[PDB]
Structure formats: structure tokens, C-alpha cells
Amino acid sequence: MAESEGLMPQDLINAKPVAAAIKEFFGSSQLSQFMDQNNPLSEITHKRR
DNA sequence: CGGGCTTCGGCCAGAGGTCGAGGGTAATAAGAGAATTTATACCTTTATCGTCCCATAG
């Protein structure tokens, strides 16, 4: 319902949901987990998992 | 030929080792302003309870 003159593209889009989704996936997903750094081989076998 | 009567098929419930150990992540937006109640603060009024003088019973 907003007008082209009444609203600007920067004021229409809310970027909060995409940032929240990216943060949630990168911090709380099952596949996101702390790297095994006790061995250099542990890192390689974790990233190739 | 309707009717008990057995049987079968679809649907839902419940239950799935224990004890560790470590790590991480956990949840937001109206202002105004009017109104009503409530905790506060000062003050007076009555009773209460600590307190002692006094007459007396032995």
C-alpha cells in the first residue's frame, strides 16, 4: 500500500530475519560444532566428515 | 434373507542400556495522561506496662 514516493527501498526491507537465520544456522545447527584441535589430523578428519 | 458372529484390516500408544566426560545455547518495544490506590510521613490520643511510694500483716 505504500507509495513509490512515500517509501524508499532502504526503508522497506528489514534485514533482521536473514541475519537471525544465518546466526542460528552458524551457531546452533547440529552440523555446526567446535573443531577438534587436539591433533592436526583431527582437524582434517573433522572437515572431511 | 436379515442377523448374530467371527475375523481381519486400518489406526494409535508405548517402549526401546548404563555410567561417565567435555563443549555450547538458551527469549523483546505506544505515548499521553487520567485516575485510583497505596505506601509514607507527621501528629495527636488512648492504653499499657515498667516503676516506685506507702500502709500493713506477721
From Swiss-Prot:
Top-rank lineage group of the source organism: Bacteria
Summary of the function given for this chain in its UniProt record: DNA-dependent RNA polymerase catalyzes the transcription of DNA into RNA using the four ribonucleoside triphosphates as substrates.
Family affiliation: Belongs to the RNA polymerase beta chain family.
Subunit details: The RNAP catalytic core consists of 2 alpha, 1 beta, 1 beta' and 1 omega subunit. When a sigma factor is associated with the core the holoenzyme is formed, which can initiate transcription.
Name of the protein this chain belongs to: DNA-directed RNA polymerase subunit beta
Organism whose genome encodes this protein: Pseudomonas aeruginosa (strain ATCC 15692 / DSM 22644 / CIP 104116 / JCM 14847 / LMG 12228 / 1C / PRS 101 / PAO1)
Span covered, complete protein: 486 to 534 of 1357
